[PDB]
Amino acid sequence: DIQMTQTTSSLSASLGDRVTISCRESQDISNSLNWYQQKPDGTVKLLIYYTSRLHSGVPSRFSGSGTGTDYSLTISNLEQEDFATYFCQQGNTLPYTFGGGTKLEIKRADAAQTVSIFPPSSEQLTSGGASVVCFLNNFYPKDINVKWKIDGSERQNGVLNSWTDQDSKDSTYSMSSTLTLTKDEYERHNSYTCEATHKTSTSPIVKSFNR
Amino acid sequence: VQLQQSGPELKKPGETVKISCKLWYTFTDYGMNWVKQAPGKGLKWMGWIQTNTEEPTYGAEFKGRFAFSLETSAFTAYKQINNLKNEDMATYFCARVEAGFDYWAQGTTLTVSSAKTTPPSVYPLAPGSAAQTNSMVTLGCLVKGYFPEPVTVTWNSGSLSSGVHTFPAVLQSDLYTLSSSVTVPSSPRPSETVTCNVAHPASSTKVDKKII
Q1: Count of CB atoms within 10 A of residue A188's CB?
Q2: DSSP-derived secondary structure for B95-144
Q3: How far is B166 from chain A (nearest CA, A)?
Q4: Given the DSSP bridges, would you call strands B108-112 and B9-11 parallel, antiparallel or unpaired?
Q5: What does the DSSP assignment read for A137-163?
Q6: Which among B81, B97, B114 is the end of a domain?
Q7: What residues contact residue B170 under an 8 Å CB cut-off, 6+ apart?
Q8: How many domains does chain B have?
């Protein structure tokens, strides 16, 4: 086949900035390389085709260039709409193939989170199971990770972490990590730990209550 | 000029779905593309359908269960899938084939589940006796055991619009689960009353859960 590989899956720059996205193909694709844009609501749109032709409706802020197997899309006056995910594709042969994409998230300062542990609700208890919820919010950059070490137990099995997207207002993320189980298996451990590894520290931030 | 897809669609493994795409320009001049975008994945060309000769062409992984219909007189290109499997839920787009994928559609999100319309269980989350070691304080509402999507979650009918975070649903136990958090100052937390309102359209379920 013919694969399209984009150098980086994710990229972080600031408004007004200028950034360049790469895409190399597995073999000479003459100049049949097109670029598209996907926005958070799923819609896609042709940006540049045949390496560098600007499609009708695309601003001059977009530009393409390349030959052989390497191409580049360069966006010059970074605006607020331009913070979506971009894709490359070859029109040289069937099957048509695209690259993994590359997403633009806005660059900013660092922020460790505000961590909170919530003990299982009574109404749930008096039903069948018990979920422990750990909220980690408003931090940057997106990378954080967590282990549930309930005093020498790592309940990675049956955990649901969940990610938010770069909050509109202040550009951070937030993560929920739910550790749901049974009244039985909860009603014998009585010692639940929530560990959280983030840049800002080397000291793994841990939060708890023990009953 | 625009292509309008159909969906969303709920299907159980085994049934078949027929997704449409209708247009606005000289239909038969340009063929039609079908693209499968799976969730944490990129885009993949499933294939074409030539509008004038009705001759389709398939990406090699999309042979067999996938077929290409098209009803010229109305200007709709179809795409049905037989023997629906898990593997098949994803957004499907149609983009006309040109000097690049010209115009796309909105996509149609197909979900395969054999799970029934289930109402949610909103449980309230609170610190309890945990001494608030901050001028901020945080609350949450846990929405678990529901199907399908989505649930709309507000705080005080919108009045509490900032400080809120409503996390993406996680598919566990074949049903969904999401959570939301609000963060309010140390004073209006208990004296004032903070409550979360969940509503599930499918099941006409709406419930308020007041917090400790």
Answers
A1: 8
A2: EEEESEE------EEEEE-----B--EEEEE--TT----SSEEEEEEEEE
A3: 8
A4: parallel
A5: EEEBSS-EE----TTS----TT-EEEE
A6: B114
A7: A160, A162, A178, B176, B177, B178
A8: 2
Method: X-ray
Distance CA B94, CA B75 (A): 13
B137: domain CATH number? 2.60.40.10
3-state SS, residue B28: helix
Identify the bridge partners of residue A45 per DSSP, sorted by sequence position: A37
Direct distance between the N- and C-terminal alpha carbons of chain A, in angstroms, rounded to an integer: 58
Resolution reached, in Å? 2.7
Mutation for A interface: B134, B142, B161, B183, most A CBs within 10 A? B142
Which residue in the block uniquely carries the two structure tokens 């971009």? Answer: A86
A116 CB within 8 Å of a chain B CB: yes
Taking the Cβ of residue A114 and every Cβ of chain B, the question of whether any pair is shorter than 8 Å is answered with yes
Question: Which secondary structure element, helix H or strand E, spans residue B49, and what is its range?
Answer: strand B43-49
* Pair B12, B108 in one domain: yes
A103 in contact with B, Cβ within 8 Å = no
**Chain A positions in Cβ-Cβ contact with residue B93 (cut-off 8 Å):** 44
- β-sheet bridge partners, residue B140: B125, B181
Kindly tell me the sign of the dihedral angle through the C-alpha atoms of B127, B129, B133, B134.
positive
Nearest CA to A138 out of A178, A118, A168 is that of: A168
